[PDB]
């Protein structure tokens, strides 16, 4: 055999990132709750609205916008999940606005832009902002003010094939949604086993501020808004 232990020194900013990551766990009391979403409806919608959508808006219709809009609706329903707890003053600051940070992928790494005031956006606007920030961040010119102060987060581990896992809360928030890969699985529809494209979804919430019942109902609201997008119009 052989032995060798070459090494590299940790730079300043990576050390800062590690310290911040540990502070995130040492500040919040994190727990996770899982659920499954039937992705048939979104796939069926996009597989026929993609062509006309591409012609109209010069954009590709992914399913990220549906999740972003559903999460925005769920947050609007339950303000507490949109709030954050500040220990420096012993105050639970609420927020009337809602902006969401979505992770984008670059060969150099992954970064998290922010979508400002998502409550007034359609699917087209969300997709356009996502594409604009994904091409703007592909080149390194992404400034701090486009990454600062998200209230809620959506993490994408699905594109790499994970089944389900526990994400970690980005410091200045109270929750994070972690999506995962879509897999064909057998499910029971109307008392009969059937094959559908399903995906597990995991939510991590700060148990100090958000009760377990609140987190579970919030996740079920996201599920309801993603399975049948027409729920968004009914304000149901």
By beta-carbon proximity to a copy of itself, the closer residue of 145 and 191 is 191
Q: Which residue has the tokens 């991590």?
A: 204
Ranges within 79-138 binding a copy of itself (CB under 8 A): 85, 90-97, 105, 109-110, 116-117, 120
216 counts as binding a copy of itself under rule CB under 8 A: yes
In the Cβ-directed half-sphere of 37, how many Cα atoms lie within 13 Å?
32
Instruction: Report residue 171 as tokens.
Output: 């410091």
Residue 159 CA to residue 44 CA, distance in Å, equals 19
Using CA atoms, how far residue 63 sits from 126, 182, 214, in Å, is 11, 11, 25
Least Å from the CB of residue 236 to a copy of itself: 16
Catalytic (active site) residue 207? yes
Least Å from the CB of residue 140 to a copy of itself: 18
Least Å from the CB of residue 159 to a copy of itself: 9
| Choice from 55, 108, 139, 192 touching a copy of itself (CB under 8 A) | 192
Q: 54-61: list long-range contacts, CB under 8 Å, 24+ apart.
A: 57/124, 57/127, 57/128, 59/124, 59/127, 59/128, 59/131, 60/127, 60/131, 61/123, 61/127
CA angle 69, 75, 78 (to 5 degrees): 145
By beta-carbon proximity to a copy of itself, the closer residue of 116 and 136 is 116
Task: Using the rule CB under 8 A, give the single segment among 53-61, 127-135, 136-144, 162-170 that binds a copy of itself.
Answer: 162-170
How many residues does the structure list for the chain?
A: 236
Least Å from the CB of residue 33 to a copy of itself: 4
Residues acting as catalytic residues: 207, 211
Binding site for a copy of itself (CB under 8 A): 1-10, 15, 17-18, 21-22, 24-25, 29, 31-36, 85, 90-97, 105, 109-110, 116-117, 120, 155, 157, 160-168, 184-188, 191-193, 195, 207-209, 211-213, 216-217, 219-220
């Amino acid at each position: 055999g052989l032995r060798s232990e070459h090494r590299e020194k940790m730079n300043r900013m990576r050390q800062r990132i590690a310290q911040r990551l540990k502070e995130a766990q040492n500040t919040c009391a994190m727990l996770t709750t899982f659920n499954e979403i039937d992705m048939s409806n979104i796939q069926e919608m996009r597989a026929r609205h993609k062509d006309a959508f591409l012609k109209k808006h010069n954009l590709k219709l992914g399913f990220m916008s549906a999740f972003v809009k559903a999460s925005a609706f769920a947050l609007q329903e339950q303000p507490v999940v949109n709030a954050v707890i500040d220990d420096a003053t012993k105050e639970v600051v609420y927020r009337d606005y809602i902006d969401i940070s979505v992770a984008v992928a670059t060969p150099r790494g992954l970064v998290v832009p922010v979508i400002r005031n998502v409550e007034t956006m359609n699917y087209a606007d969300i997709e356009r902002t996502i594409s604009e920030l994904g091409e703007k961040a592909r080149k390194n010119e992404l400034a701090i003010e486009d990454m600062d102060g998200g209230t809620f987060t959506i993490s994408n581990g699905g594109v790499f094939g994970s089944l389900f896992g526990t994400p970690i809360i980005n410091p200045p928030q109270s929750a994070i949604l972690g999506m995962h890969a879509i897999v064909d699985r057998p499910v029971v529809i109307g008392g009969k086993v059937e094959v559908r494209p399903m995906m597990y979804v995991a939510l991590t919430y700060d148990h100090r501020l958000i009760d377990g019942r609140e987190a579970v109902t919030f996740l079920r609201k996201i599920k309801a808004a993603v399975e049948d997008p027409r729920v968004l119009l009914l304000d149901l």
